[PDB]
Amino acid sequence: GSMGSMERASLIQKAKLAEQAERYEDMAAFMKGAVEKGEELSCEERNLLSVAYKNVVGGQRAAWRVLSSIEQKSNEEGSEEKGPEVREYREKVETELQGVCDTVLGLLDSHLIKEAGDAESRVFYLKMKGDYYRYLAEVATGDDKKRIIDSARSAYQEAMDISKKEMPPTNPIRLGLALNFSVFHYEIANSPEEAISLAKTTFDEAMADLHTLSEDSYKDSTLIMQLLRDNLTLWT
């Protein structure tokens, strides 16, 4: 596509510049171009891909929630019996959000997941597949909603199975996966008890493995453990 004439290394360099400049749409476009070169991504490069699209979709999710809230009030008992504009603009933002998610899912399917054989890469990509199906589920109605939810679940579950076999309980990718799957259970799947159980087991198993870690690894793992605790405090 548009980045087809730019060197892979230049795309990566410019993605890092875009991050520094808080130009996340540019960052995502550079990283999409890098993926489309066809080579596997290094750990650092996977992280750049994730940061770029997390920030793009994050702005869209925040906007969608604002507009959805306004739309719910306007169709409350006796509010602005107004025109189609709120719905139209919410729908515009929704379609753009869905397009970003579809783009990410398309990169994962062509061909990042299939060429990912190491546990770190495969878990990372499967987690990302679950996350972007989850973002689709946040806005979904109509006949395929259940199916979007099951796609998220299936991706997270395959990631979980690999992570438990192949990674220690403090591994940051394993922890972030468990955190996000617990959010899926609580916010998407109407399964708060499963969410709570998963967060607690994850936290406790990580705590028992901290003794194996260096000072730097300890810092990385405990940061994510605190997010598990923060959710448990919200949920219980």
Binding site: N47, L179, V183, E187
Partner: peptide, 10 residues
């Protein structure tokens, strides 16, 4: 408040 998720870094 919505639940907190995580990717890469804070």
């Amino acid at each position: 408040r919505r639940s907190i998720s995580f990717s890469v870094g804070a």
